[PDB]
Design a protein around this ligand. Sequence first.
Ligand SMILES: [K+]
Ligand SMILES: [K+]
Ligand SMILES: [K+]
Ligand SMILES: [K+]
Ligand SMILES: [Mg+2]
Ligand SMILES: [Mg+2]
Ligand SMILES: [Mg+2]
Ligand SMILES: [Mg+2]
Ligand SMILES: [Mg+2]
Ligand SMILES: [Mg+2]
Ligand SMILES: [Mg+2]
Ligand SMILES: [Mg+2]
Ligand SMILES: [Mg+2]
Ligand SMILES: [Mg+2]
Ligand SMILES: [Mg+2]
Ligand SMILES: [Mg+2]
Ligand SMILES: [Mg+2]
Ligand SMILES: [Mg+2]
Ligand SMILES: [Mg+2]
Ligand SMILES: [Mg+2]
Ligand SMILES: [Mg+2]
Ligand SMILES: [Mg+2]
Ligand SMILES: [Mg+2]
Ligand SMILES: [Mg+2]
Lengths: 263, 139, 152
Amino acid sequence: ARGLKKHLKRLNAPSHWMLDKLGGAFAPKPSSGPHKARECLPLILILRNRLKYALTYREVQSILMQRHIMVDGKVRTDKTYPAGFMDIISIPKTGENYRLLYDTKGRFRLHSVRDEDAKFKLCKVRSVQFGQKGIPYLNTYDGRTIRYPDPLIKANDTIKLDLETNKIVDFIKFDVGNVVMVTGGRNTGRVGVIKNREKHKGTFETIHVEDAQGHQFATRLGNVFTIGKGTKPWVSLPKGKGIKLTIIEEQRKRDAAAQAAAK
Amino acid sequence: GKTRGMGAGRKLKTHRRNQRWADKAYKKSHLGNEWKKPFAGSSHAKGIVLEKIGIEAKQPNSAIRKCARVQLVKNGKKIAAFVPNDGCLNFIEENDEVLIAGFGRKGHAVGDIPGVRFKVVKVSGVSLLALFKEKKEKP
Amino acid sequence: AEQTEKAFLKQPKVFLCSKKTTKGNNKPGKEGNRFWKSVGLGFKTPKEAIEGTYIDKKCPFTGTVSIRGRIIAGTCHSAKMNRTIIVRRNYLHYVKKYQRYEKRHSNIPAHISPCFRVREGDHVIIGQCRPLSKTVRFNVLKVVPAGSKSGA
RNA sequence: GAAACUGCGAAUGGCUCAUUAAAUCAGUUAUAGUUUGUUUGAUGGUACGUACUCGGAUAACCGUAGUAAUUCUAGAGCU
RNA sequence: UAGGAUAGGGGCCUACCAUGGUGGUGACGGGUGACGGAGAAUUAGGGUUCGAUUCCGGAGAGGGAGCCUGAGAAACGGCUAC
RNA sequence: GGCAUCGUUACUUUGAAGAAAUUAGAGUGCUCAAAGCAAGCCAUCGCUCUGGAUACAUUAGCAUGGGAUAACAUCAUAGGAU
RNA sequence: UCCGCCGGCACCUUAUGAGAAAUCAAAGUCUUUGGGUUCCGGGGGGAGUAUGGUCGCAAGGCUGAAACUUAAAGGAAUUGAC
RNA sequence: AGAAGUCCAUUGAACCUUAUCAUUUAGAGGAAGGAGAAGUCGUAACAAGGUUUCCGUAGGUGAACCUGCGGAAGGAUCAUUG
Ligand SMILES: [K+]
Ligand SMILES: [K+]
Ligand SMILES: [K+]
Ligand SMILES: [K+]
Ligand SMILES: [Mg+2]
Ligand SMILES: [Mg+2]
Ligand SMILES: [Mg+2]
Ligand SMILES: [Mg+2]
Ligand SMILES: [Mg+2]
Ligand SMILES: [Mg+2]
Ligand SMILES: [Mg+2]
Ligand SMILES: [Mg+2]
Ligand SMILES: [Mg+2]
Ligand SMILES: [Mg+2]
Ligand SMILES: [Mg+2]
Ligand SMILES: [Mg+2]
Ligand SMILES: [Mg+2]
Ligand SMILES: [Mg+2]
Ligand SMILES: [Mg+2]
Ligand SMILES: [Mg+2]
Ligand SMILES: [Mg+2]
Ligand SMILES: [Mg+2]
Ligand SMILES: [Mg+2]
Ligand SMILES: [Mg+2]
């Protein structure tokens, strides 16, 4: 009340952190970092609860202190560091370069990308204005800021950003006909192609997207993330990429029963 | 009869709000007088046996009900409490410690006893039922 | 003139003593000029605000106040004030148990610039701004006189 | 490596519901009306009018104590 | 209207000016054995009653008031006064 | 990709944003159950990318389509439209 | 004197209607429940009493409780008794 | 550089009178309801209740009540074209 809060109750944790209700009174509060602490997956919830590498809040530390975790091309030790979207969690030694992608149910998935594809990432772009001494800068959506950007780059764009030599390799503008993945709300994790953008003077830029399998859905100007030019994404999607409503999930379970086992 | 306009929600709500007061139970509960009763909105109470009395049962009955005049310790009010289970007036003595409860009709006289709304449940920390059935002895 | 107080009233950052000419200089309010801006949201700046001599720092068009937030339409309730009116916002509250509507209202104090002529019962459109007084949080953006919208 | 100086924390957590009836609060807004240790990214040319690195203290320590008394308190000598 | 103060808007405060502001669509005032919400009980439907308590927000450290340090407190397992 | 400038609402449809927990509800033989979000399998130096679904959530607010039923003023000094 | 129309005070017969029934052509068109609107009742007493407010010269009028007490009070019709 | 002290302004606890609001209670005396198997005095109402009954109002007397004026049938008359 008189200041900041350093505790996060388990029942107050974000939903995509599927945490057992009777597992404790507290959840790991995400540290300050590049991502918004509600759309992030802390490292504690990576070496635990997603991989069986660590078993407690004592071996996550025991393997972070060995400097074994390299997120976004940099060794990180803070166990509650907020890896939030498409961050390259590159585990050295064993080589587990993982892109944090959005499951069709709003979850977080560690898509195992190849090593040479793990040397870059992509970032969404916030406003672009003039800095001190009249030097334009980028100010992406994951805390990153890049000075001297190419003048074609504008707001809401996406940039393919290198890691070892941090410079913009190329970029995709925000326009209709581009692959887009939704990263917020109920439509999280659904890829599609923008059909038209509707503009309301004052607020609420609404984007209408067409799914590959024929479905259509709308969302805000936020929560969307351009992925690739035209209809070809620049990254490997985890699987499915379609909403897959409950009935067809039941059908998949049925055919899994009727095949494979089939007995 | 009734106001059936779609724009007449306030009239219906206000009319029902006014007319709830004719209800006996609603007026009993929402007038706040239940706090001025001896129990002051409590299920049981505790008291000191001031004296042992008998009241003649109302007509057409004919008997002597062994009550007890007691004084509550929480507010000092003096009330008469019935003593059931024949022979249980002997267990009660003077200036004794008793636990009193309501009689059953929620602030109304029960049976032929004139103006008695309480019954003795415990005496000296022992239930009248246990003493009556010889399960326990008065300390 | 517009100077009716014990201090000179001027538009901030508008130099009124430049020797070089004007009437052709962009951003009105340069080299000596009335400063005015479009509030956006599809609202037209009145001619009485561009070609005006009044000074009002709380005016949305020629002042330091920007319109953002909520836009509310209503009717003028009382205009007995100095550049401030009361707007009555009538609506219907849904009594759920009886599934019926009851008429409700709410007074909203708004600041009206000297470019808008108003009368009691006029139809006003106002927009939320930063607090300007204890109760004023809206600025009048459009005024339509009562008994209007004619022509067929 | 005890003690001590320095830095940081103790404004979180825990407990309770007395005050409070458009007030708190819920949904929804705005900061173009502001502050923000911290985390992440980026950015620091003008001092000139001994720089192969300047100065005085002080704690722990040691020894003179006061008071019935307390993480009550005063002097001295080092660093 | 112009200042002062504040991290900042604002009668928040000061000087001057005007007479306004709310109300049977219940202001103002009173009662609450009234913290608000998510929710609880009972429920054909509608509903009625409850919601101190583990999740969110607010308030308090016997009762009031003032304040230092600090990025953050009018803090009480901090100080000052009654 | 155009390009306008427009009676306002109620109503209704579709969408979005919407804390968890609780409720409804899919899967799952904790020996059953109330529960929990686990687990299951060849009999592996492992696999199922294992799962950790989905609704509702008044009213108020934002956006899309509909104009039947309703409420406002607009209706002949032409100060009308082209 | 005869016929017809509108408006009014009533009356007679009959439910296929309603109602606890007396009875009602409206007291009908009501579990097959919704044309609009005003007032007003919630078992019998205490009681149209106490007190406050207010009008009146007064007598009084309008508004109007509570504690407590009670298992019935009451409506229509039936058979006896008187 | 700087302590004690001092001056003005400001926030302002706390105490001391008056007034006022809210809550509980004592009180000589009056007086009202209710209950009680003890009663005294009459018979006001129910039959034409032995003066038909009842409303408003005014007066009167031991008590039910009586009487004056206007009204009603809830009357003991649905009726005299004689
Ligand atoms: K601190
Ligand atoms: K709110
Ligand atoms: K301010
Ligand atoms: K600090
Ligand atoms: Mg905005
Ligand atoms: Mg220290
Ligand atoms: Mg706390
Ligand atoms: Mg109050
Ligand atoms: Mg409000
Ligand atoms: Mg000011
Ligand atoms: Mg003043
Ligand atoms: Mg309280
Ligand atoms: Mg609560
Ligand atoms: Mg507790
Ligand atoms: Mg709390
Ligand atoms: Mg506090
Ligand atoms: Mg205490
Ligand atoms: Mg304090
Ligand atoms: Mg303590
Ligand atoms: Mg504390
Ligand atoms: Mg009654
Ligand atoms: Mg006679
Ligand atoms: Mg008689
Ligand atoms: Mg008689």
